[model samples]
Target chain A: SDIELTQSPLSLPVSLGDQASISCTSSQSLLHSNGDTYLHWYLQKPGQSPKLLIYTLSNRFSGVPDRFSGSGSGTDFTLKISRVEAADLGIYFCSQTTHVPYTFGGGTKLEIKRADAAPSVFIFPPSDEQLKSGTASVVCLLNNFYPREAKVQWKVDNALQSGNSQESVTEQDSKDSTYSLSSTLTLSKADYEKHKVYACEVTHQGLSSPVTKSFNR
Target chain B: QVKLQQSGAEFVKAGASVKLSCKTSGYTFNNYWIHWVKQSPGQGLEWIGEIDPSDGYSNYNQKFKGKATLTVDKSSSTAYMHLNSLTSEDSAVYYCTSSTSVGGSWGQGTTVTVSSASTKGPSVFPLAPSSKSTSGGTAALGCLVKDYFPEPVTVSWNSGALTSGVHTFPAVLQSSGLYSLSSVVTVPSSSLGTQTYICNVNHKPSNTKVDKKVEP
Candidate 1:
């Protein structure tokens, strides 16, 4: 028989020093004949591997922060983090090992909300060699957008452009805990010469309105 | 330090079959069991089955009994899942995972898409009749449909319109590369004696509409 695990509160927003509690429910009791539940908890940070937080019901893995704790038994379990910190933001997953396949919950993302900061925008000009190839590549770098959520939109000659745009995952700055996002747009030399205005628009909850950076050739 | 490496994406036609591989390293492969999981577009995860590399013993989820076959190669330390009679509903990302009693690891996922059209409709479950009423004082009836492919099954009550209290849960993809849907309709207790509730199911594969009726 297989067991199903579900986590509640798909996402959470918190500040430093706040207490967070996540609930996990299983379709059936994960308790084995030995009276121990085979449930475990993990946290996966962006661009990082999953780290074990709790194992075998309520036991915490070695070297795990004491602020992180696990409770409950049988079919119901809870993973609570006391005094949420910047490093605690990520996705939380609950898994059951009692069954052969060892099922996992869908996952609950923890979002951090901080004081809003505008991004430092910059555009890189295409290389001479690239220009000779009849294609022009422009790179836009948006640095230090607090809250780590934003969208990048490109416009050619004031008209919106779609497709052929590549964006990188949001990167967190270790020094100030800010986030940076980057995107690249490539265009044919004919289109680049035909268009006088090229703009990159960034929209973020941190900003009251979209921030736009325009380049003209 | 145990690690799993999965095969790349595959594109196959309906009625065809595909065998996905997961290569493992950094641990005693025979000491752990490899489990297969599936995730379709915009759908949740489904446990396919698991294989014991030490002895080649396999256990499959009942829903996947006839649709999936599990195998392993001890020499190569690779685990394989063979999915048969594929359909569009079988288009999904498949993952191989390994675990001990407390912790485990997962392989990078492999994507499989069935590009051909489906030829068979779903297997519909018979409507179960009940005379029970909710605490809110309304009679309820339920219906279930399983083993359908190509997705997006339209369900309705009777020939015309559905009552106000009718609701259907989202369809769930089963391990067999098919889908299952469950729905319930609630009505006033007084109408239970005079009304006949019907469940109609429509799918793209079959030309004939599948339906069932229940009376209290």
Candidate 2:
């Protein structure tokens, strides 16, 4: 039921002040009997969710800068930027809603040559409410990083540890298209008392050194 | 388990309106989507309309938008369908069905025969009119008839009645209690890539005659 779509240049290399345009084509006419095209464009900036650029053809969504524009008709359409800027570096894509199963097209990257920045990391020690349940738990949160995947290592009292101790290694994209990750470690009440300190060490391809946060029991 | 119990056969006059009821039980009446469908000899099955009882929001097929009205009574967990400007074309078995509950409850349909008529005209659908090539270079053509009451319909290919080499199978009764008959004829497969045929169906009741063509 989904009408498929095609988008191009998978990657557009652009410098600041240079005009940019992305093309989108559909397998069928996006035109409806009601005289409206069902194509829309979106941009997902780093660490943020996607924002609509155009909803029904060239009409821009509220708050969108005039630098961004959309045009074209029938099965072929385009999204053009009057001038690219540092703030415009992210991912752009298109979607069609004229059919039963609305579909989103493949993403095109708008990057600064090629770069991956260090992420923001935080440690959440066992909350009073969590400790009250007779278990010790801690969560390591990583935010705003490109190349969205990462790994974690747990250690007890400066000694490397591995087992079913890792309760979770959840990861998801933040609103900005960067990733947010949370790795949780749980220990029984008796096991918690046996440890002097528990640590969570996180590493990603973007970093040469690991970022480690420890919870002193 | 949920249940849908509908009213029995309906007897209404032509140009008059009638209201049929479906008393439901064991489910939140206004929480689910309920729909009605029409089945007749000639048109097969037609979806009349559906309603989201919670808000009284209803959607109907454009063909019956002005003819069928769907509503519900929350207090009694009952659903109602009102048919107006009755005609022979509107004569059919109407079913009350649901959107949830596997297979939902198809309340034994409510039957209506307009003009005080009971017999159904021939429901004819022919098949393989262009000929399906066989391994032996011969083609098989078929004509199918089903769901019409008061059996025994006449089927002929081209202009002559079908008999020998013609396989006229038994008229079997369907779960819906209607008879379905089938016939197939064998002929030399076409080589010119241009062959179109027709099946002539003749029903005695109302003397309904239909010629169906099957091809690409």
Candidate 3:
């Protein structure tokens, strides 16, 4: 699946000579060795198709200007504009170039990031138990953490095991280190012992040493 | 300066078929070849095939052998691919890349969703790895050439002063209007010391060959 952005269709504006910031979001880090740091920034002006602005870091392909630059690493990255101009008033797009079925961020419509605004986290409630009949699974969520890392595991019948599962981790800096982590696991009912236990365990990487929370279904 | 804009959505109903087209701009329509590629969601890029708008000469990804069809209309300077009998597994974003020896420069992708109710069609190229072999205690090396257009080309293996193996394969124009050929030549250890293998491609521009030596 394509990486999801922190803020969708971010809106920012740079009145002539004003500075602006654009951020891209991803489910995972966008780093790869084989020329695959597939993040790219594009600018689309009126009546024109999108043009490649910055690719594989801050390197502009051919005729791009030096005013646009990119910085950041791993799951978090920022594309900046030192001085916005009248020509820069169009839509700016960010995209990932690695892994086929490449993806693009919803884009940061350059209007402006509201000042005096506090960092916010959107919470999603647990959904229905769509787990297959007689299946085993685990899910974990970690928020408001530091050093920015976490892990999740599934236990069946009180035994650590692996099956269909998913893991997500994210990090951001507002005033201090901010991070998030989540994991999901799935197994069939035939594999779950009747009256047995299924648990979701979460691990925090920066809690003095480590902290864990376990959930059962 | 040519561009390929794709048309369609992220997912299509299973058992249904989808048609994709690459509308061309910038270059003369009859002058270039167009290529099609497929990338399953979260997968690596795969060369589905290429079609020469000039003569309609086409080569397909062996994996897409039966499931996909490649066609073009020189009159329209556009290329098209139709995928039938869609399935959840068939979900992918198909792209039209400009193919030439220089490697394919791609366009924005078109996502095709395959969902239930999609009519089943013949299997396209089966997803399988190409076979490889070593001979003369040497490994086979493959090279893809860029630039040559709409002409027959030959690829061969040679040792200094001796032709080991020479084979000719058809070169096709990709959707990008450039010529491309995937060629393999065996390089023996003996050829490594002072050994060099050459990949020669021929076209109207002129017959050209680029030689690369294996490093010890």
Candidate 4:
């Protein structure tokens, strides 16, 4: 039989200590012939892989918070985060294993509403050895930001440039509930010499203004 | 400390077959099950099937029963998925995940594109009943889009007036390696009666647009 998992409250904006409830419904009952509802839940933070939260209906995985609970059976299920924490922000998904073809529910994102906090920005110039090769790479590091959603743009001589670039996934600091990110831009020797300044500008919802850092030859 | 290292991208001809691999390290490979997942461009995630390497036991999602074959090389701690009779619908990013109850570790993902083929639009499911909050007094609506291919589409809600609280989540790849997307809109209870909610889906590749109105 075909299986489908549908989740409710596509996105929720919550504050600390607020209660959040999400619902996942299966097109058909997930109860197996073995008498178990083959449903599981996961929480995927931005730019990170999904983490197991609940399995086999109501069992919580190791180290999962006690306030996180799962309930219901057969076709309808619910995952409730009793008191939303800063760390609870991300997407929630539910899946079923009762049938041969497993399916997941569309994720429900948890958005936290809070004051903006700018990230600590830093730019690292290319090494002296790199200049000899006619190619240079510069890195911009952004740390200790809240809400995790942010964009980083590269600029050459104060103008935006579409150079070879890579951005790291947002990394969360469990200790402070903040997030960090890193981005790199690679340029040819000709352009590196022609441009005097290279900058990394970061924009986040929490920030009143974008935070930027620049590097020079 | 389990790690899943997957193969790079693959571009195969239509009607041809391709075998993708996932090599694992840093853990006892045979003790866990290696499951396969699929994701089309801008689509959501889908669980294809799983294989237990210890004894060569395997299970498949009915949608992929014959389309995909799961195998393992326990000696190398590697898992392989062979997809046959490829079509545009089979083009997607495939990931190997290690799991018992839920996926614990995942590979970066491998892209497989079937070239020289036409695409298909998704079949939209009926809108779910509007859910109302007892304390907050808000209404939420949801709809599902499935079986799309060569994906790049938009799913949105249109009320009589432009509504602002609509959020469309990422699309998930299905067992057949097709695409699916889900979207929801939240509104005040007082506005529910005054406005009609419509699910609007646009498939850019085919230049097609589909609209389904939510029944009151």
Q: Which candidate is the best by lDDT?
A: 4
lDDT of 1 by residue, A81-174 (tens): 9989878888898888777556788888887656788765655444444567676656555656687677899988888888855665444544
lDDT of 2 by residue, A9-66 (tens): 8878666788999999999899988888878787766434355677677887766799
**Candidates by lDDT, descending order:** 4, 1, 2, 3
> What Cα-based lDDT does every candidate model obtain?
0.72, 0.66, 0.52, 0.73
Model 1, C-alpha of A41: deviation from truth (Å):
2.5
Off by over 4 Å in 3: A1-138, A144-150, A168-179, A185-199, A203-210, A215-217, B10-16, B27-31, B41-43, B85-87, B99-105, B117-216
In terms of TM-score, the best-performing candidate is: 1
Listed for every candidate in order, the interface RMSD values in angstroms are: 24.3, 32.2, 23.8, 19.7
Error of 2 at A65 (Å): 4.5
| Comparing 1 and 2 on DockQ, the stronger one | 1
Order the numbered candidates by TM-score, best leading.
Answer: 1, 4, 3, 2
lDDT of 3 by residue, A115-180 (tens): 222211111111222223333333343443443435556665677766455544432323333434
Instruction: Please provide TM-scores computed only on chain A for all of the candidate models, following their numbering.
Output: 0.79, 0.53, 0.48, 0.68
What CAPRI grade goes to candidate 1? Answer: incorrect
Estimate, for each residue in B53-168, the C-alpha lDDT of model 4 and write its tens digit.
Answer: 78879998777889999999989989999999998788787888887643367788888888753477876553333321111565555455655776667877773254464445
DockQ, every prediction: 0.05, 0.01, 0.01, 0.10
Local error of candidate 3 at residue B42 (angstroms):
6.4
Docking verdict class for candidate 3: incorrect
What 10-residue stretch in candidate 1 chain A is worst by lDDT?
Answer: A168-177
